[PDB]
């Protein structure tokens, strides 16, 4: 509105070119829906500083005589979390808006609201709320289990088909239930749910002594995502519910469907998401997602106390970045890199007489054989896994046969292969979202000149 100095021409085409940021930033706050097309960092930083400028720790006239007035010491800490200081949520409930921290609980709201659009574009069209929880995949299924311990206080067990991740077992001992855990059948090379072992044991326990059935999408192959049709009608009709790990499923569209399928035609109460494997951000956060949304409130009422709203910013500064579009170019990038880390491994495997094990129910992670490897003692299957991560690759973890883990008190047998006696040792790899066409490159050429190492030893 400076117009003594600037002529009122362009003055007029600056101030109207505003009204473009605006009119960006209205239609979020109205429909509460990611952008089509992502924002330009410019439309993003005005959005976020006017936020920020709402909390009352920012006020221009503000004076704090409480013990929890978003003070900050070093200017590094506050610049780099654009001025957010009071967290989201309040004492007795997370999903409350704060009465001090009026721009971090807008940010909170808009949060979540992306992230169910997200979550219905992705696949579970038919999911009703969602909230995001600062706290890894892990502790966020705890916090769906301390939640149906007040609803089912006569339950002790959780039903849980076997899948070799201590974050996700932990969840349950953590809580204080007792895990069951019912073992995969191997169908070919696929390890798949033990549907009538599973309802046998809920007739030999008891459905009011089952605390839930704790179900799992995502997983490393040969283990698939299980049979959540065929679960979630068991915990209809014995009304059991029904917790589904759905770690890194978001980015799989035949995932989704399953959990969408599987609430069509039985129960499934929650599923929990990892951000950080998911929407590609630091490692801390979650979402907790459900088709009763009186049942997701009670979850969200069930965290004391106030929250990070670190992982929250990240989300929205991400899928606000990338938009809709952006993301769904990430999914179809993820399904085109699944072919070619696939057939990459094929042509790999005829050359060192081994084979890629038929998983495809599992549209992740990939196998490959290392039958013709071992020497009984020579330790190959070990020194692979070393020498990959010498020649910096991650993310190939290798099983060997007879591994024995001790997690939480209980022995797992044929650890990281998800069953007591698998057939054979294998290479994990797999296809997540934001991996580029050099990794696999990278990876074949390294794993290929590691191969050759051990047969020339
Ligand atoms: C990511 C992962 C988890 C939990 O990971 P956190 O360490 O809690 O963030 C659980 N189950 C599976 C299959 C996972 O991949």
Redesign the pocket.
Known sequence: AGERLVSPAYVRQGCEARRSHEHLIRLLLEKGKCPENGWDESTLELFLHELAIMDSNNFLGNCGVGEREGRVASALVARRHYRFIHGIGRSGDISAVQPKAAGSSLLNKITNSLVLDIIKLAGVHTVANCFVVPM????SLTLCFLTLRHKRPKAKYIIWPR?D?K??FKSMITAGFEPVVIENVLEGDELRTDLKAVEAKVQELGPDCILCIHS?T??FAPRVPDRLEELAVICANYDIPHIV?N??GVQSSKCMHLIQQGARVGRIDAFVQ?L??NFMVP?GG?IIAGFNDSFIQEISKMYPGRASASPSLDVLITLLSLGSNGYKKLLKERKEMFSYLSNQIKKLSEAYNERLLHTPHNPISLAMTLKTLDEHRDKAVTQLGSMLFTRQVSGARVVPLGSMQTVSGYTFRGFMSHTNNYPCAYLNAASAIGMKMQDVDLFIKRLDRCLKAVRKE
């Open positions: 890894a995949t892990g502790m899948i991740q974050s996700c799992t995502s997983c790990n770690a890194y990892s950080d494997k490692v979650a």
